[PDB]
Amino acid sequence: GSHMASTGENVISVAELINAMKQVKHIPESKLTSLAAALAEAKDGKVNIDDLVKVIELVDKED
């Protein structure tokens, strides 16, 4: 929805990255649910948004 958000972050917190991802990658339905859950169970709970959000949202196939 933003085409290119150009969001390259070091590591972002789960909620922060939820909204950021919402503004970074296409949102059909709430992919955020899956991305959030795995981010909550992540190693620190704060991780680089694209790698995590996208791998969860791509792999869980919540899309």
Swiss-Prot record:
EF-hand domain boundaries: 27-62
Q: Where in the cell is it found?
A: Mitochondrion inner membrane
Residue positions binding Ca(2+): 40, 42, 44, 46, 51
Q: What is the protein's known function?
A: Plays an important role in maintenance of mitochondrial morphology and in mediating either calcium or potassium/proton antiport. Mediates proton-dependent calcium efflux from mitochondrion. Also functions as an electroneutral mitochondrial proton/potassium exchanger. Crucial for the maintenance of mitochondrial tubular networks and for the assembly of the supercomplexes of the respiratory chain. Required for the maintenance of the tubular shape and cristae organization.
The UniProt similarity line reads: Belongs to the LETM1 family.
Q: How does it assemble?
A: Homohexamer. Can form 2 complexes: a major (300 kDa) and a minor complex (500-600 kDa). Interacts with BCS1L. Interacts with GHITM.
Q: Which disease is it linked to?
A: Neurodegeneration, childhood-onset, with multisystem involvement due to mitochondrial dysfunction: An autosomal recessive disorder characterized primarily by global developmental delay and variably impaired intellectual development with speech delay apparent from infancy. Affected individuals have hypotonia, poor feeding, poor overall growth, and respiratory distress early in life. Other features include visual impairment due to optic atrophy, sensorineural hearing loss, and neuromuscular abnormalities.
- How is this protein named in the record? Mitochondrial proton/calcium exchanger protein
UniProt source species: Homo sapiens (Human)
Taxonomy, top ranks, is: Eukaryota, Metazoa, Chordata, Craniata, Vertebrata
> In the UniProt record, what gene is named as encoding this protein?
LETM1
